[PDB]
Structures are given as structure tokens and as C-alpha cells.
């Protein structure tokens, strides 16, 4: 989401006060606060956000780059940037951290695909 109207009942990933580090999403306010306090590492928060933001059927046919053996859709890039910003504001992730978090997201998408077979 670039705007509040995209998800009127949702939340901002990142910080609403920063136009360059915010992405509107479908997660409701109380659920976002639950994720904040229950997901105690950046990796756990990333993977939990992924399950709130992308249906498992979408995860099964997607990955970050949109590449695979018979094609994969890219996970929505603006939403992924929103995850990055959200993790930065909560945990202070570095570039190295983010690369690894991306590896964990891609592994989760591969697991979603395997579970369907
Ligand atoms: Br990004
Ligand atoms: Cl809150
Ligand atoms: Cl778990």
C-alpha cells in the first residue's frame, strides 16, 4: 500500500510518521501490536508478517526474486520493503541481517510449495 485508503482498517508497516519508510497493509491495529510484542526476533517477526500479508497459496507460487523452475511470482515488492522498514524500526536490522531474513522468507515459500505436494 502506498496510501491509507488501500487498507482503511489496516496499519502502516514501518512508521507512519516517515513517508519514505512506510507501507500500508491489511494487518489490523491490534494484530500489529500482538506481532510487535510476541515476535521477539527479526526473523520470527518477518515470517509472521509474511503469513499475515500473503496467503499460503500465494507463498507456494512466489519468492522474493520471482524466479523458479517453472516460474515464481515476485512477492509484492512494496510490501517486502514495508517488512524491511518494520524490522528496522523494531530491531535495527543491518544489510547482512536483511540478506539472511530474505533467505528465511524464501525458505518459508519453498516449504509452502512442498506442503502442497
Ligand atoms: Br527491500
Ligand atoms: Cl500500537
Ligand atoms: Cl512457531
Numbering used by the authors: 207 to 323
What does the paper say about this structure?
pmcThe BEN (BANP, E5R, and NAC1) domain is a ∼100-residue protein domain found in metazoans and viruses, but missing in nematodes and urochordates. The BEN domain-containing transcription factors regulate transcription by recruiting chromatin-modifying factors to specific chromatin regions via their DNA-binding BEN domains.
We then carried out crystallization experiments and solved the structures of the BANP BEN domain in the apo form and in complex with the palindromic DNA by using the short and long constructs of the human BEN domain (aa 208-324 and aa 208-347), respectively. Structural analysis showed that the BEN domain of BANP mainly consisted of a short N-terminal β-hairpin, which was packed against a helix-bundle core of 5 α-helices. In the BANP-DNA complex structure, the extra C-terminal region after the helix α5 in the longer construct is disordered and unresolved in the structure. The structures of the BANP BEN domain in the apo form and the DNA complex overlaid very well with an RMSD of 0.68 Å over its 101 Cα atoms, suggesting that the DNA binding did not cause significant conformational changes. These findings suggest that BANP could bind to diverse DNA motifs, acting as either a transcription activator or a transcription repressor.
